Amino acid sequence: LTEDQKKKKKEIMEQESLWKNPDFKGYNKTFQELHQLSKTFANNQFRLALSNYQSGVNTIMKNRDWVEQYRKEEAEKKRLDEKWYWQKVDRKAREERVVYREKMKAKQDALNYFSKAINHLDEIKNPDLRERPEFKRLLSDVYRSWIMAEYDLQNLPQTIPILELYIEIDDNEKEYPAHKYLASAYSFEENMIKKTKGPDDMLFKYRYKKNVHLLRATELKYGKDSPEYKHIVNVIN
């Protein structure tokens, strides 16, 4: 591979890791770095924004532990009134509904914390402070976790304004997952217009934006004038 192809391969893997579903090793790495950045930044509103962001991610981590424990406790129950196939499926559907409703509440609490993290960053008014790598790192982490929290629950239309705000920050526009999620969420919205028989202007708006971010994600991962880039361009043209 060339120096650009090797660099690109390395970067796509780092970006896929960046958007990895949360776990304990990523949590530890993320917050230890954010606290070191907070000490460098020495800004009380950034400190508060981080305290809230961490509380939001903690809500998510608490839920992941709850879901495993809940499913475990249910698995260990004896079901005496489960003689029929429809009884087994019904009980399964009831389990999934309880899990989804609890995940929905955890998402709502996590987004209230993320909203507070943003409201504190909003209080940093000095343009020299809003341009801080520390400011941009935290703001990117808040939006990324916010996008993922909604994405997991299939709340794709809600991810669009946050993905858009995300890609405007510190070259995030060059991230392949960011364009993949935008393209998928736009695709969902296009399908909503087709299913609900909505207006043509919105059909084409959503289709257009899907194709822009589909092609851009392709360009970023495979490169300009790659068999894959040429293919997507030829489908669009």
Binding site: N28, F31, Q32, H35, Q36, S51, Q54, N58, K62
Partner: protein, 184 residues
């Protein structure tokens, strides 16, 4: 009378000793969280009273544990400084205790008052020595001035270990154990 005061001080000296003997065990965390708790691995640094987090948290040469406690803001901090290097073996289930060279604690929130003053910083420079090590405990007072616990009248000296220091030693031994058990 002074008899009860003497017995009380003795019980408190032993209470801080038994927990310091447990705190010296948290070496098991160097080769290795409960809610709102953040652990850093590092080394004694600067003037020897503070712990500097490692770039490499998992590094085998870390000789200090830095633990931050949050609640609803930072409420508490502890720095455990250990004497001696870690065992070469990478498995924490095999690691042994190291007598503490120092324990440094900070109270930021949920501050206790000793005769109406806050001791925000406590610096124990002989945690695994004779339980009666009040002359080795520096108290940083806010209304932060340095006082030595052994020069505190006594109730006062008793209230210091009963209300501030033992409880913090126990809270942190509790948290370090919580982290260990989760990852062990």
């Amino acid at each position: 009378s002074g008899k009860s005061m003497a017995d009380t001080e003795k019980e408190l000296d032993d209470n801080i000793s038994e927990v310091n003997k447990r705190l010296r065990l948290h070496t098991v965390l160097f080769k290795m969280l409960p809610h709102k708790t953040v652990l850093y691995k590092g080394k004694p640094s600067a003037d020897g009273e503070r712990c500097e987090a490692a770039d490499k948290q998992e590094a085998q040469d870390n000789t200090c544990l830095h633990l931050e406690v949050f609640d609803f803001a930072k409420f508490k901090k502890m720095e455990l400084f250990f004497e001696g290097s870690n065992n070469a073996d990478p498995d924490p289930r095999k690691e042994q205790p190291r007598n503490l060279t120092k324990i440094r604690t900070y109270i930021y929130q949920n501050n206790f008052l000793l005769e109406d003053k806050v001791i925000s910083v406590i610096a124990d420079v002989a945690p695994n020595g004779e339980p009666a090590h009040n002359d080795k405990i520096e108290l940083f007072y806010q209304h932060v001035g340095k006082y030595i616990l052994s020069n505190v009248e006594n109730p006062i000296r008793n209230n210091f270990k009963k209300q501030f220091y033992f409880k913090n030693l126990d809270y942190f031994d509790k948290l370090f154990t919580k982290i260990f058990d989760y990852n062990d």
